[PDB]
RNA sequence: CCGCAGCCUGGCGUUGUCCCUCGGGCGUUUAUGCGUAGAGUAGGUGGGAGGGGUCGAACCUGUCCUUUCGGGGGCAGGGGACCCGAAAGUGAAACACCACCCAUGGACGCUCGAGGGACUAACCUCUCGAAAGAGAGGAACAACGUCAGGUGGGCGGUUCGGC
RNA sequence: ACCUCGGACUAGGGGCAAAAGACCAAUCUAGCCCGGUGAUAGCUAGUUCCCCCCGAAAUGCGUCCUAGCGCAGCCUCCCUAA
RNA sequence: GAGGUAGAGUACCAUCCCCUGGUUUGGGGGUGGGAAGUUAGGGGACACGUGCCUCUAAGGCUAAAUAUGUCCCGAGACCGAU
RNA sequence: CCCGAACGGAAACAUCUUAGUAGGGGGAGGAAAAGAAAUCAAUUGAGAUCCCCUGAGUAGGGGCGACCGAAAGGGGGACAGC
């Protein structure tokens, strides 16, 4: 697909339809020392089999594409619903 | 208070260590268990109540460093309990020191212990060892408790200071 | 699917002393600096118009080194006492004193590397020696412990869909 | 490479095997005995007094699920409700 | 009022391992470092700082209050010779 | 007091749990152990330890799965401290 860089949509803080910056969604860094991460080593310490099952088989060819819009007039950022696509082209 | 100054030289670091290294070598020639007529660092022994009155004695012993001397299993086991590296003898070497030391002189009893030197291949400790059958200590008001049986062979059940330490009180 | 022995490598400890070339430093020892306009070496920021002055200066005369030989910096004697301005320029001035930074070199006690070498006193191997102790070769390595990584059906538990 | 006798040694995930997965006490694809341990069975057989009333299903969906279970439908018993 | 004493490879720290709820927080050990010590230290749920509160280890030793039937008295909705 | 299991459970099973029990080794006594806080908790309080009832399947742990599982306080017993 093709999507323009700027889309006039509603801004919750601006309480009307405003211009926005549109870009793909990117996951953040794993951010070690998380509670869900801390227990991993505390569960991996000692002797035993691979404590947590890990996925090895993959079925879906692609992954869901998500749109991220930022509200220029108030620096707000909104999170949109995902969708399955080949590759979301950001060219206007 | 010499005992205050004995470790003033040897508190954490002193060139005294070079001298002991010489003593360290000769002790390896000495038997793994032996008797020394006068205990080394009285600051500990007297701190454990040792009295130079007739009826006490000092013993030195050495042990090998490393993890636990545990065999690999052979039957059908789950991976959890079958690894080997990383094990360690749960009860401390300070504790183990008296044990073999205790067996040496069963007609006596153990009170307290400490190391005095240590290299990368051996640990060297010193242990108070008391005769209770001596007709001297038999009449002490200050240690009349020992006349009872229950004080015997204690180190094997871990009622010594090390045992209490191993139990983490 | 994996796990654990064993193996290979490396780190740490048992680990000592002389070093040796170089590259790093640690706490020190010191000394070396021109885009233009200008009395002229303003390298860049500070307190600072006072700093030096028998609590030794201006002047010129040489021995000497260096540099964009521009020019400044260090030598005592000849000279027994004088110069910079708060005054003229510079997007940024005082060779007025004392500080900080960049930057060049050597050295001092300590540390790490590219490493290399040497020794023996550790330790190891062997022999003699009743013991005690002695001698011979390697060597701060090796080996051990511990940790990590690579390998690892040598051994251990397991699954091996459904219609 | 004969045969055999007396003594002795090698222990089970081991021992021995001029090696057949053979033998190791009649027990050998992992010996025996005793203990974990009254282990595990979505399997198989049995389950015992009388009378009387009421009185089914063999279907749907889900399930490493079709020799079982969960939610339904199908039963009985009780109470309330008008 | 003045002065003095008051327990080291111990605390504590990093790492590996063990276990317990102890979890970025507990205790033990191995390994490596490693203190202060009265004008000391520790503790008061992640870390650090600040105040406030309470204890003083690294040595002892200890009456009773509970664990049990090899045994001895007593009692029993325990069985009557498979 | 050290060493240290599988069986099963999770409808599979490997982390986990079954479990520091079965069992090994050492050493006692008639009881043993432990026993005088580096204890708690929290408005500035209590005052050794032990066991009994609660606190409480609470806190908290874990493919957050089966499951595991405190403490403080209160209420009882004897309450001795050198």
Curated annotation (Swiss-Prot), chain B:
Keywords: Ribonucleoprotein, Ribosomal protein. GO terms for cellular component: cytosolic large ribosomal subunit. One of its GO terms (molecular function) is structural constituent of ribosome. The keyword Transferase does not apply. It comes from the Archaea. GO terms for biological process: cytoplasmic translation. Belongs to the eukaryotic ribosomal protein eL15 family. This is Large ribosomal subunit protein eL15. It comes from Sulfolobus acidocaldarius (strain ATCC 33909 / DSM 639 / JCM 8929 / NBRC 15157 / NCIMB 11770). The gene is rpl15e. The chain holds residues 4 to 172 of 217 of the full protein.
